[PDB]
């Protein structure tokens, strides 16, 4: 029980760090934008700069459209990629710690008391089914 408690607090550390490290980040929107127009003329043209206002720069990325610098070419993008990879790594560590606490706690329930049978599944992932009997 005390090494399961150690693994539980490590999982909670990583889980809160995932939460408050992804909360202060900016994810890209992916939504099927649908604008409503008149009969055939507005539809059959190209929606002439109603929110485009430059069809190069603030047009296809919508985190900030617009109508009218420390190493911007690689280094800030490198830092963005590294913070995204950091929260990806926290996700891996939290799911790994989740699995190991699940196995440790399954062993802990298994060594308590009550009757139990070693259930073997199809492949070999063994399991334990307990007797239908209530605790006195």
């Amino acid at each position: 029980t005390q090494d399961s408690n150690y693994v539980r607090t490590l999982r909670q550390i990583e889980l809160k760090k995932l939460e408050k490290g992804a909360k202060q980040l900016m994810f890209k929107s992916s939504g099927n934008h649908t604008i409503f127009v008149d009969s055939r003329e507005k539809m059959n043209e190209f929606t002439p700069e109603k929110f485009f206002n430059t069809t190069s720069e603030m047009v296809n990325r919508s985190e900030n459209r617009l109508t009218k610098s420390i190493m911007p070419k690689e280094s800030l993008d490198k830092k963005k990629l590294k913070k995204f990879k950091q929260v990806k790594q926290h996700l891996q560590r939290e799911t790994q710690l989740k699995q190991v606490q699940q196995r440790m706690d399954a062993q802990r329930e298994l060594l308590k008391k009550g009757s139990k049978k070693k259930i073997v599944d199809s492949s070999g992932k063994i399991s334990f089914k307990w007797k239908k009997q209530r605790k006195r």
């Binding site: 999982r11 399991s127 089914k129 605790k135 006195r136």
Partner: protein, 121 residues
Amino acid sequence: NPKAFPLADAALTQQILDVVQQAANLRQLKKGANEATKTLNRGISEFIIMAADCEPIEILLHLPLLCEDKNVPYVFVPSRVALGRACGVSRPVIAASITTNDASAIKTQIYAVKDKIETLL
């Protein structure tokens, strides 16, 4: 009890207590208000069963306040005595959280009941 939102009807609470019984056999539920809040704060709950019979019901209805924070299904059943019997303990049990396992045997039952819980929200 008027402050017991979603309260299950008889057929829904029959299948809820049956999935409680077989989760308790597979050692996959945590039974009690403190243990249910611990499974919620760790985020290992499939859903929450509560009993609309605890005589101060305010010893319960604070885990609804953090199920609305953690978008997990919760439901109420009429009797704490029946919930204790279905949990497989000798005591009346006020709330019970069914913990998450992916290799479990009753994963399909757990999903069907938690869908029929969050259909009435």
